[PDB]
Design a protein around this ligand. Structure first.
Ligand SMILES: CC(C)=CCC/C(C)=C/CC/C(C)=C/CC/C(C)=C/COP(=O)(O)OP(=O)(O)O
Ligand SMILES: [Mg+2]
Ligand SMILES: [Mg+2]
Length: 354
């Protein structure tokens, strides 16, 4: 049982009307390769509710194009559950770096034939890259590859902490978590689904970079909150301390406080990030191009949609897939903005408030 203190997110959420079609097709898609999925793994993929996640990001998008983003979520939720922090401990970091660079190369060069030493991941990734190239501009395809590099470099960072069972300092986690959560790689598909390139001049501008990092960090921190109970449910089944790779545990260790106080501090931070995102959005929207306005629309649906999906998906409530209701997370809504709109004392992210 986890009670999340009141979150400030005055943004509307909507679901895509074709979740069932998207679910049917993404299951049939992933079953078409050679991943040798067990019924347990197929059940857990259902619990991930990838159509509900990305459908909440792009609830007005055409179903056949949204399928591309949903299918990416399907295979990368699997990649995470099987190829991240798994396998023998000996040579684990080398194994990950090798697989990661093949995935990136296939996104750049779908016929690179980076072979199969018992490989399963690259065939679906190649299918995604080929499908994306039918719709994406070359710049959009570049953005996907680079966003995967940022995610994968962050995973190598995370795996170092997991192997040491160490807890990152808040200043380090605060800018890294957007990358370990694959925020940019997740959202890079959206402008391809939209079918229009966001101008580089806009995406690279400091105000849009701030908005991007604000949105992905908030969503990742919200994930730390709605996946916190699943973390405690894992630490209780393995009898170990909870992982330090989480905002709650980081604030607990950093403030020498108890779990309720840390949950409050984590939500307080999420609320200030959310308020800053909304405030900065208002200053950016007047001069935004139509593709940038669309991008900001997706980030605005991401924040409340991610929360709703995370609080209800069986991924965080029935973790192993055979324990209905093992974890229950509740959350409140704070209807008032944070009283403190100043930058937090976190130098690695303070420039979002510039
Ligand atoms: C930052 C993003 C946009 C939202 C929150 C992060 C998650 C929900 C995005 C899922 C999309 C895709 C599968 C991303 C790849 C990495 C993925 C495994 C992140 C999930 O967060 P973790 O903390 O690593 O795992 P748990 O949430 O299950 O604990
Ligand atoms: Mg995980
Ligand atoms: Mg998590």
């Amino acid at each position: 049982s986890v009670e999340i203190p009141p979150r400030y997110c005055p943004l509307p959420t909507a679901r895509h009307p074709d979740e069932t079609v998207l679910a049917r097709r993404t299951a049939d898609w992933i079953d078409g390769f050679d991943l040798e999925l067990t019924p347990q793994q197929r059940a857990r993929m259902r619990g991930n509710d990838c159509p509900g996640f990305y459908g909440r990001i792009m609830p007005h998008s055409p179903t056949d194009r949204l399928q591309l983003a949903v299918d990416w979520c399907t295979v990368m939720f699997h990649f995470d559950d099987v190829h991240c922090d798994e396998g023998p401990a000996t040579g684990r970091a080398a194994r990950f770096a090798d697989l990661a660079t093949r995935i990136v190369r296939v996104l750049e060069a779908p016929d690179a034939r980076l072979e199969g030493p018992g490989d399963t991941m690259l065939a679906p990734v190649r299918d995604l890259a080929l499908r994306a190239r039918r719709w994406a501009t070359p710049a959009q395809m570049r953005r996907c590859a680079e966003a995967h590099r940022a995610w994968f470099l962050a995973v190598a960072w995370e795996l170092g902490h997991r192997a040491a069972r160490s807890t990152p300092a808040l200043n380090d986690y605060a800018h890294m978590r957007q990358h370990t959560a694959a925020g940019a790689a997740t959202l890079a598909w959206a402008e391809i689904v939209d079918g229009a390139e966001i101008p580089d001049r806009e995406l690279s501008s400091p105000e849009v970079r701030a908005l991007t990092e604000l949105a992905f960090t908030t969503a990742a921190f919200d994930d730390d909150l709605f996946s916190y109970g699943k973390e405690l449910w894992v630490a209780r089944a393995e009898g170990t301390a909870p992982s330090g790779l989480g905002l709650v545990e980081i604030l607990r260790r950093e403030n020498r406080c108890g779990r309720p106080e840390a949950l409050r501090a984590a939500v307080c931070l999420c609320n200030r990030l959310t308020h800053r995102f909304i405030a900065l959005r208002e200053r950016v929207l007047p001069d935004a191009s139509a593709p940038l306005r669309a991008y900001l629309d997706h980030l605005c649906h991401l924040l409340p949609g991610n929360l709703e999906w995370g609080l209800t998906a069986d991924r965080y409530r029935n973790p192993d897939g055979r324990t209905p209701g093992a974890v229950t997370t509740t959350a409140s809504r704070d209807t008032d903005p944070p009283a403190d709109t100043s930058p937090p004392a976190i130098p690695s992210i303070a420039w979002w408030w510039d």
